[PDB]
């Protein structure tokens, strides 16, 4: 999926916030990896994407 930079932290085991609470929540015993990379050159346009 795609989020904003400040929301990257929200994608973590047991995290809170709008993204973690209403969009994508990880289990407390999550066993995996999270890889996030800025996509400002692909997911942003002049005038707002």
């Amino acid at each position: 999926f795609v989020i904003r930079g400040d929301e990257v932290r929200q994608i973590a085991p047991g995290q809170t916030g709008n993204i973690a609470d209403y969009n994508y929540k990880l289990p407390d015993d999550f066993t995996g990896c999270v890889i996030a990379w800025n996509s400002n050159n692909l997911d942003s346009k002049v005038g707002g994407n």
Binding site: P13, G14, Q15, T16, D28
Partner: protein, 49 residues
């Protein structure tokens, strides 16, 4: 005259009282009341306490 039996009863009562009183010690936790820990902190944090 009844020192031996009174000492036994007192020792048992003291053991039980100490055991019950132990419940209120923080043991390094922020609080000795479990519900307070659950309410005040997030689940990931509350688990450690």
């Amino acid at each position: 005259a009844l020192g031996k039996l009174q000492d036994v009863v007192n020792q048992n009562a003291q053991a039980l009282n100490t055991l019950v009183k132990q419940l209120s010690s923080n043991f390094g936790a922020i609080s000795s009341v479990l519900n307070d820990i659950l309410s005040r902190l997030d689940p990931p944090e509350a688990e450690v306490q």
